[PDB]
Tab-separated table of C-alpha atoms (C1' of nucleotides) and ligand atoms in Angstrom:
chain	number	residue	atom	x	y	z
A	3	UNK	CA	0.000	0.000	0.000
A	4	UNK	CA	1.221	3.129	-1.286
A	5	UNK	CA	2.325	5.749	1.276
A	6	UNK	CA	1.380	9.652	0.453
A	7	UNK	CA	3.707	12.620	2.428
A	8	UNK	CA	1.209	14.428	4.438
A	9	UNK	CA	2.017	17.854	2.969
A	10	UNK	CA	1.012	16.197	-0.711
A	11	UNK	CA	-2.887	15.298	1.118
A	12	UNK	CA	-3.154	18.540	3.027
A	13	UNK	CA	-2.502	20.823	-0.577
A	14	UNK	CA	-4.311	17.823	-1.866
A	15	UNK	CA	-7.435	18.089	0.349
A	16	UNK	CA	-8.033	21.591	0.253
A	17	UNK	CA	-8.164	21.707	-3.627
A	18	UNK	CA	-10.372	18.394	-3.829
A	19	UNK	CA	-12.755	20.247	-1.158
A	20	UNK	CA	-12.834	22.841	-3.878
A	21	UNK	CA	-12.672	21.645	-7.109
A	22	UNK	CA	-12.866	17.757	-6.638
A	23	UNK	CA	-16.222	15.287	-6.063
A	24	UNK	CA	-16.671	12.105	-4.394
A	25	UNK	CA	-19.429	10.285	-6.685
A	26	UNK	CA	-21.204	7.227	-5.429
A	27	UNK	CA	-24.007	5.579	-8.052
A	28	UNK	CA	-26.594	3.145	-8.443
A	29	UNK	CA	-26.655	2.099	-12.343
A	30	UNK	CA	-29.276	0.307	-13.437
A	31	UNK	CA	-28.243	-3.253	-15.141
A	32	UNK	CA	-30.261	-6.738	-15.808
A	33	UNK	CA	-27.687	-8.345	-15.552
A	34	UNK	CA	-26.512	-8.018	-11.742
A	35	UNK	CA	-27.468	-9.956	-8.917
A	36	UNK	CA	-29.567	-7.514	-7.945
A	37	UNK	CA	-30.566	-5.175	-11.172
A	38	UNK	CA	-27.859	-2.775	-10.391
A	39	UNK	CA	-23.859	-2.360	-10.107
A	40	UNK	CA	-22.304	0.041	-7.644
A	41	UNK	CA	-19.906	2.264	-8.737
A	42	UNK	CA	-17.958	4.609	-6.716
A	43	UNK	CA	-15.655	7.822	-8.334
A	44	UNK	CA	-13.141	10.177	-7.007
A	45	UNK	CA	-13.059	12.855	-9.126
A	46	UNK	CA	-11.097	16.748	-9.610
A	47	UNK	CA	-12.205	18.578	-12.465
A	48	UNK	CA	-10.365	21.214	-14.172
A	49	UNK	CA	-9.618	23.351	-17.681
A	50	UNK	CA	-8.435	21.267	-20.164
A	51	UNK	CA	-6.079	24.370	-20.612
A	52	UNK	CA	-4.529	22.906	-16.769
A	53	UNK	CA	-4.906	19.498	-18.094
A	54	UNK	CA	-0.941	19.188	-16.788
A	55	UNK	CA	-1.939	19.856	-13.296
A	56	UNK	CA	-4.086	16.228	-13.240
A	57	UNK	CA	-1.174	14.888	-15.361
A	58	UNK	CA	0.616	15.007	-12.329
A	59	UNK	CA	-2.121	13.753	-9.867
A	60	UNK	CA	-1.545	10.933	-12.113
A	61	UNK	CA	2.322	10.579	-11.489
A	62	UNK	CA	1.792	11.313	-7.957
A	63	UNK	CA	-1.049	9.313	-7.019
A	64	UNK	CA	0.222	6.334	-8.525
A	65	UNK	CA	-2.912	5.414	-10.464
A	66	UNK	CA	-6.110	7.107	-12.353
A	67	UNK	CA	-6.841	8.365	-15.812
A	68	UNK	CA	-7.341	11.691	-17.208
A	69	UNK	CA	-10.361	12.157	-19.664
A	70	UNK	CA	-11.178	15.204	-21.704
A	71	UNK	CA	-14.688	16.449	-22.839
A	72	UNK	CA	-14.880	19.427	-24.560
A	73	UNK	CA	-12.819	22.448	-22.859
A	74	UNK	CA	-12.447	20.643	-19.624
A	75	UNK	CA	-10.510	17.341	-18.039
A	76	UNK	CA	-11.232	15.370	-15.152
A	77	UNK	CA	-8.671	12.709	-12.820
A	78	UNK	CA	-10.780	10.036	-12.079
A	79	UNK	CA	-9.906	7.204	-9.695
A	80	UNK	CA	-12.952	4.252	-9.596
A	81	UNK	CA	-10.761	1.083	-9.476
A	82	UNK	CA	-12.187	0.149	-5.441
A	83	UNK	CA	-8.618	-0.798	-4.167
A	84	UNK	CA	-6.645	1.832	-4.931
A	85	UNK	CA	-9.427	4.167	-4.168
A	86	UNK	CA	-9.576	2.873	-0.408
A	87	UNK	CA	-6.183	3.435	0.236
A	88	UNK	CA	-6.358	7.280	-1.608
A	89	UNK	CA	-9.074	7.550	0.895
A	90	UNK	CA	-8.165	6.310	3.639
A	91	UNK	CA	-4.994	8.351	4.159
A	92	UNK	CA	-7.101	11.648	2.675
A	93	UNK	CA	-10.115	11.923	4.540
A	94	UNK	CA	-8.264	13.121	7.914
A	95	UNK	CA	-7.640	16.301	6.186
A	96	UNK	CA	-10.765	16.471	4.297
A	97	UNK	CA	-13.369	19.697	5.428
A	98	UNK	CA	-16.059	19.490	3.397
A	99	UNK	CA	-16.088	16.128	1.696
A	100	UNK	CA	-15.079	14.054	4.770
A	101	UNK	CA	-18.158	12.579	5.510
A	102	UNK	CA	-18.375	11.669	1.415
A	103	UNK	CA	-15.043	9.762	2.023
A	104	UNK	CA	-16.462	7.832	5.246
A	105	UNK	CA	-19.141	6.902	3.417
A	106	UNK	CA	-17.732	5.577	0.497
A	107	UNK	CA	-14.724	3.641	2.612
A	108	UNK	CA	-18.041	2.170	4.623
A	109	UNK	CA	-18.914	1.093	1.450
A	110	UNK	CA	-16.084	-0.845	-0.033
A	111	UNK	CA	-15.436	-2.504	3.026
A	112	UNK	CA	-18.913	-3.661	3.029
A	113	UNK	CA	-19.328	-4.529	-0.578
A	114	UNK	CA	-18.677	-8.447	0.071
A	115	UNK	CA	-21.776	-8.615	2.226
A	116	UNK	CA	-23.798	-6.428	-0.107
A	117	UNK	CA	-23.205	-8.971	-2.743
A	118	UNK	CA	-25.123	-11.756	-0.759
A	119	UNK	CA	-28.301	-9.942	0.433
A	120	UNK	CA	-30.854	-7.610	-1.065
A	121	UNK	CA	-31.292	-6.122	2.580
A	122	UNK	CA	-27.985	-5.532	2.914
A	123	UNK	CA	-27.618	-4.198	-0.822
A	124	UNK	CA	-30.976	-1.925	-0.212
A	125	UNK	CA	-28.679	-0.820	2.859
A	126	UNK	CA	-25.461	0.018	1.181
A	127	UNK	CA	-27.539	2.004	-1.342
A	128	UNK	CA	-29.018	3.802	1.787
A	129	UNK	CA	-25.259	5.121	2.288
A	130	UNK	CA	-24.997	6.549	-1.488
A	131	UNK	CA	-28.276	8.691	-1.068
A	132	UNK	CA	-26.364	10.098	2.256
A	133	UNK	CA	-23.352	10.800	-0.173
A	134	UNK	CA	-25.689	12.431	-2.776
A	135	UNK	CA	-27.433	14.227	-0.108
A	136	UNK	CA	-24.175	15.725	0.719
A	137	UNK	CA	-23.165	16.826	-2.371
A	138	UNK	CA	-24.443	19.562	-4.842
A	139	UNK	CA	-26.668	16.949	-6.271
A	140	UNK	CA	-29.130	18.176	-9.526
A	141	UNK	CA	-29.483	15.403	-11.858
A	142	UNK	CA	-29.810	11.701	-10.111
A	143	UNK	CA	-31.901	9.492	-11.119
A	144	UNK	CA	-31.377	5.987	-9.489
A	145	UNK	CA	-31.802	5.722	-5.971
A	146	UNK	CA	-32.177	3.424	-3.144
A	147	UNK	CA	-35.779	4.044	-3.412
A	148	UNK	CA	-35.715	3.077	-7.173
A	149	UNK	CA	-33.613	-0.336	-6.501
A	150	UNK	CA	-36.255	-1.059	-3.951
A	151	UNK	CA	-39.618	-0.830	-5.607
A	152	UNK	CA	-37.734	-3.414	-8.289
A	153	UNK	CA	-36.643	-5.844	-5.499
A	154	UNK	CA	-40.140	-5.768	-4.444
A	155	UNK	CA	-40.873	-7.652	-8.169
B	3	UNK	CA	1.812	39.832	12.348
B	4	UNK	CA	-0.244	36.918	13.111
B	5	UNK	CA	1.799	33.931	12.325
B	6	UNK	CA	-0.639	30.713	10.668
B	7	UNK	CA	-0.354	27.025	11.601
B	8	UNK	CA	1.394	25.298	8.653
B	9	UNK	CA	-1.350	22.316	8.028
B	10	UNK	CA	-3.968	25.240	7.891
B	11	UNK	CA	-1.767	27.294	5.424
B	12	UNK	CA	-1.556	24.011	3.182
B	13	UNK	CA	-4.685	22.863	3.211
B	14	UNK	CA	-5.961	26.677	2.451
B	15	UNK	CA	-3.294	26.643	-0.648
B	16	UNK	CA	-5.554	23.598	-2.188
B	17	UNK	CA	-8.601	25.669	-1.054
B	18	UNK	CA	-7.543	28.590	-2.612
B	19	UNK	CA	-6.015	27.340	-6.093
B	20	UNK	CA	-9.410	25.269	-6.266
B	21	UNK	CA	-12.096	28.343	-5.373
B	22	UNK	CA	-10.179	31.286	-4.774
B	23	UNK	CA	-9.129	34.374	-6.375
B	24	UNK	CA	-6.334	36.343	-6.607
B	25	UNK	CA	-7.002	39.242	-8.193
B	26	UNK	CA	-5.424	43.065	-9.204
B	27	UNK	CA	-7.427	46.098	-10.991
B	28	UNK	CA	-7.228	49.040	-11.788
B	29	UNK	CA	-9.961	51.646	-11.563
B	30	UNK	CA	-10.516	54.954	-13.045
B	31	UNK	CA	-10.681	57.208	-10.187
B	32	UNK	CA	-10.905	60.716	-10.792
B	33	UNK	CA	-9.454	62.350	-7.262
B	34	UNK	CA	-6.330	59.790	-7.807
B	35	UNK	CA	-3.165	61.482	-8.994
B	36	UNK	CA	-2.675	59.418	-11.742
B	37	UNK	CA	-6.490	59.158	-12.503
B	38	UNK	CA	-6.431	55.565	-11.160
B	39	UNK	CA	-6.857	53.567	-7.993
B	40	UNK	CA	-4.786	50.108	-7.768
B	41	UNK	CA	-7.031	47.204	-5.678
B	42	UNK	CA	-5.676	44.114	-4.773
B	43	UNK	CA	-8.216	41.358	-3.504
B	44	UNK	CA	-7.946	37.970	-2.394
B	45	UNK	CA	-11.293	36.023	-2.642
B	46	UNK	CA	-13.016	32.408	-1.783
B	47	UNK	CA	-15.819	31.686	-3.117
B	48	UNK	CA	-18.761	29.477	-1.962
B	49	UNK	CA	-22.019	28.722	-2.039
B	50	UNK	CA	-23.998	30.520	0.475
B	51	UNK	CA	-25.245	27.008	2.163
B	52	UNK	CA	-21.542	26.809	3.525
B	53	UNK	CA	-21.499	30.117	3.851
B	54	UNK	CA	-20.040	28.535	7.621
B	55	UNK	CA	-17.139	28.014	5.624
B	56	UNK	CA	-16.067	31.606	4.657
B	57	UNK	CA	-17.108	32.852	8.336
B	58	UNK	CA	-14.389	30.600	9.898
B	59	UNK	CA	-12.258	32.137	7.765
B	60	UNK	CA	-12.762	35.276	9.277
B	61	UNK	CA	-11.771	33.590	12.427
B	62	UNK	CA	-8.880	31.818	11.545
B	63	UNK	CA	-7.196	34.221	9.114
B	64	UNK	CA	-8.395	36.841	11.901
B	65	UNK	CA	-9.146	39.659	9.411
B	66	UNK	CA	-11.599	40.261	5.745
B	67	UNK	CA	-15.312	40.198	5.641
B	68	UNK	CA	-17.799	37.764	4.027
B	69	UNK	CA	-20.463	39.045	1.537
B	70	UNK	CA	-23.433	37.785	-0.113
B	71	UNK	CA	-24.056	37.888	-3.829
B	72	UNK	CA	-27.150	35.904	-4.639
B	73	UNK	CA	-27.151	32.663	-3.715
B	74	UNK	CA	-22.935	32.674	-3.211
B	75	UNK	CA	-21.075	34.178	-0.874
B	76	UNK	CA	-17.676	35.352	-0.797
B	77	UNK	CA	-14.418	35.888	1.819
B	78	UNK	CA	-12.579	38.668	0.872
B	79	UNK	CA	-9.631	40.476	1.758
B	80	UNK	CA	-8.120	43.632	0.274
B	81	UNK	CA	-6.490	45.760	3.032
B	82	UNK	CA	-3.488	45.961	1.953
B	83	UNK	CA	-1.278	45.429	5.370
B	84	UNK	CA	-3.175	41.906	6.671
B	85	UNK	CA	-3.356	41.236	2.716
B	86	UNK	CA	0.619	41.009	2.592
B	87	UNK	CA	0.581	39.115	5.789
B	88	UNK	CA	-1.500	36.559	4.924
B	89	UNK	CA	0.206	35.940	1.239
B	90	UNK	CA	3.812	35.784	2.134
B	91	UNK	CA	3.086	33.116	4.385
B	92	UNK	CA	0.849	31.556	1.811
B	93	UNK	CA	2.668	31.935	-1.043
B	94	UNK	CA	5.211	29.196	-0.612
B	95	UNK	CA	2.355	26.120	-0.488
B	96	UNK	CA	0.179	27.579	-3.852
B	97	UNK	CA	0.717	25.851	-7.049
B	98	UNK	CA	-1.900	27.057	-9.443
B	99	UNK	CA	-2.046	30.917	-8.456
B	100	UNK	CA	1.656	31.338	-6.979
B	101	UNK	CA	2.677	33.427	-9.248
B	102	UNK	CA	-0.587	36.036	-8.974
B	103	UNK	CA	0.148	36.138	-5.205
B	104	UNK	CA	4.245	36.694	-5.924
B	105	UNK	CA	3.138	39.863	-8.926
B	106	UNK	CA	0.300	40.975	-5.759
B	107	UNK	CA	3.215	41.030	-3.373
B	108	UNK	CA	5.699	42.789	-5.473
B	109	UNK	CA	2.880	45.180	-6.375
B	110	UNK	CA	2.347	45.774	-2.358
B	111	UNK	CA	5.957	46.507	-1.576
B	112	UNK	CA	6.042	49.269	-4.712
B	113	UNK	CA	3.073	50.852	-3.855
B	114	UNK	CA	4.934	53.952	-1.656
B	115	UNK	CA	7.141	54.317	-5.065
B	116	UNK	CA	4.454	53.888	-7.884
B	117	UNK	CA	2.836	57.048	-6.510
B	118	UNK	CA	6.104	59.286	-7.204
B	119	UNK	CA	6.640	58.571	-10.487
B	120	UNK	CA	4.063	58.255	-13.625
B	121	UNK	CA	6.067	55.929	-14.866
B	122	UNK	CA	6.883	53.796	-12.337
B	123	UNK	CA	3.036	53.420	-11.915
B	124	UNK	CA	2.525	52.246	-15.232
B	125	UNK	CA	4.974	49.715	-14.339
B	126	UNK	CA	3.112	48.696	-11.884
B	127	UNK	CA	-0.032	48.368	-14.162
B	128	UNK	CA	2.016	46.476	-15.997
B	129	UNK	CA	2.250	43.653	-13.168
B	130	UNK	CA	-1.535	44.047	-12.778
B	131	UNK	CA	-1.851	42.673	-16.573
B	132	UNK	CA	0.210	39.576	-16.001
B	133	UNK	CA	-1.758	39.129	-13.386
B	134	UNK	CA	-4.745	39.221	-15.329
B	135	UNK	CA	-2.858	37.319	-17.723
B	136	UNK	CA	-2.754	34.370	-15.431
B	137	UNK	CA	-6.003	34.405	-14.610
B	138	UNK	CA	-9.621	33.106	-16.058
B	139	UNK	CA	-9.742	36.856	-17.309
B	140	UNK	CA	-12.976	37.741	-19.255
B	141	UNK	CA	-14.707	40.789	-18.551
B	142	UNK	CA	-11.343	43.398	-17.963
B	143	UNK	CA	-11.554	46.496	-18.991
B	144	UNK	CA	-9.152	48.897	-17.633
B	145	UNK	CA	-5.458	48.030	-18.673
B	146	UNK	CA	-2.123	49.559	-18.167
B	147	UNK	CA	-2.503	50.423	-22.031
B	148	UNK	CA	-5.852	51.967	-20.733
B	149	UNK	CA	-3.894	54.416	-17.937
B	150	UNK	CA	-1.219	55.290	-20.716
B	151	UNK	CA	-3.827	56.181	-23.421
B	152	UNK	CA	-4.732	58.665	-20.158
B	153	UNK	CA	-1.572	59.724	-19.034
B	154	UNK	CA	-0.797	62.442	-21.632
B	155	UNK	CA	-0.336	66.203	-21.135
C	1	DT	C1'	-22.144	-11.505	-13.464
C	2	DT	C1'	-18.841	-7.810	-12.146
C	3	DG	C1'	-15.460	-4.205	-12.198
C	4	DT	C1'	-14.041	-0.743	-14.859
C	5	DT	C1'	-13.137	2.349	-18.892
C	6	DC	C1'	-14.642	5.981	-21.577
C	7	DT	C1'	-17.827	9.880	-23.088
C	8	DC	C1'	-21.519	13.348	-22.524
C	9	DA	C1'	-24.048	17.168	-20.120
C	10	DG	C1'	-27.386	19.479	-16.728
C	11	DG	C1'	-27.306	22.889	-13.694
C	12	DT	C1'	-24.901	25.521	-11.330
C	13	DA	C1'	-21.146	27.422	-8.066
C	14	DC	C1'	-17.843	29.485	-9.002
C	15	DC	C1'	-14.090	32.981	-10.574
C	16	DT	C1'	-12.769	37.560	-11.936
C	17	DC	C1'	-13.888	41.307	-12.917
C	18	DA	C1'	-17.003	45.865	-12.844
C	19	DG	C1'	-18.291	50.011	-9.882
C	20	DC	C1'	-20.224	53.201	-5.678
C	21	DC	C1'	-19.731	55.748	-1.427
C	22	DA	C1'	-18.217	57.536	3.681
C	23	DG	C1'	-14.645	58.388	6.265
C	24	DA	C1'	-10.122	59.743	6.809
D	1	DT	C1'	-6.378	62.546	-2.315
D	2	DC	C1'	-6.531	57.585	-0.660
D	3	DT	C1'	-8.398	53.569	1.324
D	4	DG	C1'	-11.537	50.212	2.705
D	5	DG	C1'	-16.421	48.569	3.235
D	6	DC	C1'	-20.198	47.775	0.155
D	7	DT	C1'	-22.624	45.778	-4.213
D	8	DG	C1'	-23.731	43.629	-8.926
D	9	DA	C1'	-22.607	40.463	-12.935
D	10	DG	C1'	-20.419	38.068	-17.320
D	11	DG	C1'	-19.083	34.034	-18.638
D	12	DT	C1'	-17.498	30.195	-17.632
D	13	DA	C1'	-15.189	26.003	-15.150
D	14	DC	C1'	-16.711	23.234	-12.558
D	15	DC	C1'	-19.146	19.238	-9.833
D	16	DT	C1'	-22.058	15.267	-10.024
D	17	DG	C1'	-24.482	12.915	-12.115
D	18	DA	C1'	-26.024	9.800	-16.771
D	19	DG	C1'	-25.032	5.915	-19.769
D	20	DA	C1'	-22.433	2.568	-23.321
D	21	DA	C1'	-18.943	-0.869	-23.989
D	22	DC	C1'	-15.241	-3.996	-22.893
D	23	DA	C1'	-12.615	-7.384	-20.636
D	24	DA	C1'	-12.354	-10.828	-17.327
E	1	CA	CA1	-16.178	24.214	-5.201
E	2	CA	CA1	-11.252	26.154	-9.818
DNA sequence: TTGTTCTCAGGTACCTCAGCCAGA
DNA sequence: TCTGGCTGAGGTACCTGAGAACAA
């Protein structure tokens, strides 16, 4: 498990408190167990013009991608692994995404049991509408509530 | 002086390269000698829900006010004395808007020369378009060309 | 079946200016 | 004459979702 310096996730907190997002979704899929796959995203936005600044979130992270659309790029982190151990050392410093990060490490940790019951499932989808709630959320669609009234069918 | 923690001043680095503002401008003023008035601001924006946010930075940084502008609010600073306080010691741990705070602080330290000479105060001007220059610039209208074009007999 | 990569975009929440006015 | 406390806004640059496809 990859070590970060603490004055890399103090700089590193800050800006993600400002210009980053900590994404948790429900996407529907017939396919799944249970109708739908998790997916979890750690995100920092920016011009594509700075596109070199998440270049070397990249390099120092260890791991992610960068993706442009139109005038502006993202880092994006989803693989689960990785993304606990990002976590786990950032959310000490984190101010206004912290309880985003708890959530999400809840989460992962309690994917394996998620897998083997719809109540528990339902439940871990409870925990994504808290991270929703908590951020600036305008356009979701799929909720707990949604991957309920399918269960019941 | 007041003299900031170092986690705080890191973490407000990310902060501030994420949602703040470091900004110079010149306005026509027609009392000032040299028919312009030099304002240096340092700004974080936020939405007024966490408006919470800005007012502990009132507390922490100890000085600036927090307005409202619709449904955003803003921390700002622009007294020029806490100003160059507060960006000498932040100055070291910004990345994105370093060099803005390094052209503000030059600025600050010339201001009791750039009102002798007219031309030593369009050389400051000048240092308030690279400023400018390095920012998201899109609505500027007064420019050091601006105060030369006035400057004459 | 599952984890993940990659792209698009809705709706702001920022950013970075503009300008006034009272007191000093 | 100068400075600092106020306010309003143009034009994005973000945030936080959506969804398709591809391995494994
Ligand atoms: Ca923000
Ligand atoms: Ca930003």
């Amino acid at each position: 498990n990859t070590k970060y310096n603490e004055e890399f996730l103090l700089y590193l907190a800050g800006f993600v408190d400002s210009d980053g997002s900590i994404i948790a979704q429900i996407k529907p899929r017939q396919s799944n167990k249970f109708k739908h796959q998790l997916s979890l995203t750690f995100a920092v936005t920016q011009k594509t013009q700075r596109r070199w600044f998440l270049d070397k979130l990249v390099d120092e992270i260890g791991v992610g991608y960068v993706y442009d659309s139109g005038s502006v790029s993202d880092y994006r982190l989803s693989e689960i692994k990785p993304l606990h151990n990002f976590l786990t050392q950032l959310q000490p410093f984190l101010k206004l995404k912290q309880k985003q990060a708890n959530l999400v490490l809840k989460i992962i940790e309690q994917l394996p049991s998620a897998k083997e019951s719809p109540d528990k499932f339902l439940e871990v989808c409870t925990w994504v509408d808290q991270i929703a709630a908590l951020n600036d959320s305008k356009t979701r669609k799929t909720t707990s509530e949604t991957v309920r009234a399918v269960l019941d069918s």
